[PDB]
Amino acid sequence: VCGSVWGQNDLAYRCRTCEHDPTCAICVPCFQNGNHKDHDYSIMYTGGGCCDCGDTTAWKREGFCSRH
Ligand SMILES: [Zn+2]
Ligand SMILES: [Zn+2]
Ligand SMILES: [Zn+2]
Numbered sequence: 001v002c003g004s005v006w007g008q009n010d011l012a013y014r015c016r017t018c019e020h021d022p023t024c025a026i027c028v029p030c031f032q033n034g035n036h037k038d039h040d041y042s043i044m045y046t047g048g049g050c051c052d053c054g055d056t057t058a059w060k061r062e063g064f065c066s067r068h
């Protein structure tokens with residue numbers, strides 16, 4: 001599971017296609033290294049947080065990056 005943490009003024013990605021709930025998010029590198037073509041994604045601020053990439057409780061497996 002990605003160990004990335006970020007702060008309130010750090011960009012991250014939401015992906016409505018991949019998420020298990022509206023609060024889920026993944027770090028920019030995990031987004032870049034995954035497959036979200038034609039997904040409903042948004043680069044945005046998230047109030048900071050921890051990456052959900054690799055976490056099957058938070059994020060769909062098809063939305064995991066190459067590295068997790
Ligand atoms: Zn996605
Ligand atoms: Zn990540
Ligand atoms: Zn990842």
